Amino acid sequence: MIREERLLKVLRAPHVSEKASTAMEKSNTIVLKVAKDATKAEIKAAVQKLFEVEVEVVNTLVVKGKVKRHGQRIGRRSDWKKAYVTLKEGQNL
Amino acid sequence: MKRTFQPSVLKRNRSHGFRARMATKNGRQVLARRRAKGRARLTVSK
């Protein structure tokens, strides 16, 4: 059983932006970064345990890294997955 | 004026894809030659 440690690694970081702020104040939902796989069930369990909050539903999407032109060279950013988590009437963070 | 190249990902992969080369020994030699030359792209990868 590695479910506990798995839940401690799916979550990577919160997402800060205008869309994130308006979603939180209006829809009571938090947007955060997750691992590349990060199935919806794992994200739901991780938020319930680590943040000790009740959740309703999770929506995930994959963001493709942009292609950047650094110096004389061309590079690409890494793809990452962000999840929208909808909390219930009781919210903490 | 219709030109010779009409792109299609499915046709490109099924014709010159990695698995297409490995099916026959001639394709395997094509991969072997390009590994020896050190080419970054072994085949047309989606």
Partner: peptide
């Protein structure tokens, strides 16, 4: 560099 995910996204006509 190479993107490998040309999945189909057909919006309902």
């Amino acid at each position: 560099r190479p993107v490998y995910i040309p999945r189909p996204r057909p919006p309902h006509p």
